[PDB]
Design a protein around this ligand. Structure first.
Ligand SMILES: CCCCCCCCCO[C@@H]1O[C@H](CO)[C@@H](O)[C@H](O)[C@H]1O
Length: 381
């Protein structure tokens, strides 16, 4: 009975680990830049490399791993994951670190498909939803607590110790899995149908554009706060914690408002995001200005996320799985797209302009957002 609750809790902690690793390079960019004598912007590629790999490869991986989803696949994953983190610990060239990130990406690609599927199969019927809420909470604890813990463990002991501590969480959980996995062992034909419905494909587009805006600025926030506002390294840590809390507030704001205003919430939130990206550099002349702007930014992108999610949910009630898969796929597509353009703008123009540049896709989203929310006003309840 409480056994099953533990198996869900362990899949959730594994989600925590996989997302803290997926996020924390933002918090470690400058330490990594120093430690290889290069610009923080070029590491943005490690941000891009992982995300685009995860997106494009999760489908062929989840495809080739389709036969044995037994704890064998989990253990194989966790072995590959802890190994990659261990290689990041000992990286002697940025090229090495990028390779290690690629390994984390393969692990995450297979982990996510398998873990989504597995959290339910190991829990009772009423916990079929609560189990979802658990591993989701893990990912929340990932961006809310996980990124700032990783960044402070880097401030103390090197980002090598950051990645090391993460692999260590992975190891104790691989053990837990071996000692709790129950030896436990295809909706892809849906895929062309979704590719046909214009509403769903247009939500996919709107996501890609807004997320490219957001990650164009966010990917390089730590190097921004230090190198351009001139502020401390601890202050960057405060901002990452603050973004987490604002995501908590955006969740409760969204949960309070309800889905009647979902389209509205989102479109207005995209407006907020444009404001934040426009006002990013001006808010640097003072510390408290960037603090306000972080609260607003975090609430905004949280509400945008929850809204796009609800929209893909309502636009494909027949294939919730494949749509959320395509969803995280195009989402990581945008994560890497934003990091890549942020890299390009940091390298060729000043990094001080990322916020300004970022507003350009955001605006597009906003306009498009308004348009498409006029046209398919469909939601959940
Ligand atoms: C079906 C065609 C291709 C589908 C590809 C689907 C898998 C994409 C990976 O999704 C992952 O799931 C988690 C959900 O939170 C995220 O935290 C993680 O960052 C995200 O990368």
């Amino acid at each position: 009975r409480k056994v099953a609750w533990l198996r869900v809790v362990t899949l959730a902690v594994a989600a925590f680990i996989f997302n803290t690793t997926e996020f924390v390079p933002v918090g470690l960019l400058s330490d990594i830049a120093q430690s290889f004598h290069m610009q923080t912007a070029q590491v943005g590629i490690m941000l891009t490399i992982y995300a685009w790999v995860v997106a494009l490869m999760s489908l062929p991986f989840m495809l080739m791993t389709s036969q044995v989803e037994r704890r064998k696949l989990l253990i194989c994953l966790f072995v590959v994951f802890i190994a990659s983190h261990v290689l990041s610990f000992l990286s002697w060239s940025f090229t090495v670190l990028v390779i290690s990130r690629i390994g984390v990406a393969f692990a995450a690609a297979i982990f996510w498909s398998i873990t989504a599927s597995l959290a339910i199969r190991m829990a009772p019927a009423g916990k079929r939803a609560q189990a979802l809420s658990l591993i989701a909470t893990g990912t929340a604890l990932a961006m809310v607590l996980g990124l700032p813990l990783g960044r402070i463990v880097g401030q103390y002991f090197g980002w090598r110790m950051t990645f090391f501590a993460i692999g260590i969480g992975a190891l104790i959980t691989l053990l837990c899995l071996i000692k709790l996995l129950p030896l436990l062992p295809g909706s892809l034909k849906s895929l062309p149908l979704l590719f046909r419905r214009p509403a769903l494909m247009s939500i996919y587009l709107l996501t890609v554009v807004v997320v490219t805006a957001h990650y164009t600025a966010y990917s390089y926030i730590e190097p921004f706060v230090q190198n351009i506002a001139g502020f401390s390294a601890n202050f960057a840590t405060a901002l990452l914690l603050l973004l987490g809390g604002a995501g908590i507030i955006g969740s409760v704001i969204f949960g309070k408002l309800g889905n009647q205003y979902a389209s509205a919430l989102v479109s207005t939130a995209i407006a907020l995001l444009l404001v934040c990206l426009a006002l990013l550099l001006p808010a640097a002349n003072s510390e408290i200005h960037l603090g306000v702007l972080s609260i607003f930014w975090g609430i905004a992108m949280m509400i945008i996320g929850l809204g796009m999610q609800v929209k893909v949910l309502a636009l494909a009630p027949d294939a919730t799985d494949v749509a959320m898969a395509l969803f995280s796929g195009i989402f990581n597509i945008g994560i890497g797209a934003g990091a890549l353009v942020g890299n390009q703008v940091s390298l060729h123009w000043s990094m001080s302009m990322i916020g300004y540049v970022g507003a350009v896709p955001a605006f597009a989203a906003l306009i498009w957002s308004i348009i498409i929310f006029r046209r398919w006003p469909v939601t959940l309840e």
